[PDB]
Each structure stands twice: as structure tokens, then as C-alpha cells.
Ligand binder design. Sequence first.
Ligand SMILES: Nc1ncnc2c1ncn2[C@@H]1O[C@H](COP(=O)(O)OP(=O)(O)O)[C@@H](O)[C@H]1O
Length: 165
Amino acid sequence: MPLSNFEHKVITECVTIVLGDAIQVAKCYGESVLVNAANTHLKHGGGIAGAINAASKGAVQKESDEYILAKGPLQVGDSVLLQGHSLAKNILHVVGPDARAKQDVSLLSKCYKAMNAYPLVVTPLVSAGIFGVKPAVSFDYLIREAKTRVLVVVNSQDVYKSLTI
Ligand SMILES: Nc1ncnc2c1ncn2[C@@H]1O[C@H](COP(=O)(O)OP(=O)(O)O)[C@@H](O)[C@H]1O
């Protein structure tokens, strides 16, 4: 019962909202895929990406740099499955839209659809931090697309209360 370690609320038979650190939730499930909310160049400086990279001792950034050098940068809405680096079975790097740049928020549908390839996914709310989309809106796109087991982890009690009220 890994979720007994965290306040959580089951929303549907697919989606559960969890209050905590997504990295610590994923650590509890060896078969989970952890979602990174990334940018087009996989530069993991801050936000959840910085935290995931630090937890990997910088290995995530090294792997990402090699990928981007070989393939070129990603487009908004793209996703790439990369190594898990002992944090999870794999890390799925998704490029959410940046609302500050007035990018198309509906591209979150593409980000969240990519999660359905995996039986168990631990994800933050993509675009809801640096990229300026409201948590409740990011959640709307997630719940519309989710067809697999998804633990949506939010690290703010204010957003947790807002989504579970
Ligand atoms: N370890 C974490 N676990 C869960 N949520 C996190 C974590 N770190 C940051 N967040 C929150 O996840 C959401 C997306 O964060 P962020 O890294 O800024 O991505 P984006 O650039 O897509 O907006 C934000 O609401 C953020 O505050």
C-alpha cells in the first residue's frame, strides 16, 4: 500500500490525485513510468525537471543532451521515453505548451495521450508551473485523455485541496 504514505483521493478507476513529491511516489512503484514536464531542448534546470535530474545525480541531463544533439530539439506536445535511472522503470519526457508564449494549451491532449502506452504512470500536472497553465486546466486535459492507471502528484496543498474539494 504505497499510497498510504500520502494524502490522496481516487477520482476514477484510472486516475488518483496524490499530495507529495512525484519522485517519492514513483520510487514506491518499481514498474511505474515517471513523467517529466520538459521543454523542447530537454534542459532540466528547474521545476520537476531539475528535481528529477538532481535525483538522478545528473544522469538524466547527460542522457538528454546526447538525445537532443543526435535528433535535434522536440516540438511542443512531443514526448520521448528515456531511461529511468533507478527513479522509475522509465522516464517519459513530455513537452507541454508554454502559456507565457501563448502556445496552444490544447497540445496538453497530445502530452497526456502519450501516457496511455504504459500500465502505470506517475505524473505531475504538465505546464502548470513555469509554463503558466492553471493546475485545474492541466488536470482537465489529463482526465479527458487517461486510459491507464495514472497517479497525478501535486506538491502544493493548495492545488491538492482545489482539485479534491
Ligand atoms: N517533485 C514534484 N512533484 C510533484 N509536482 C511538482 C514537483 N515539482 C514541481 N511540481 C509542480 O508540477 C507542476 C509542473 O511543474 P514544472 O516543473 O514547473 O513544469 P512546466 O514547465 O511544464 O510548467 C507545477 O505545478 C509544479 O509546482
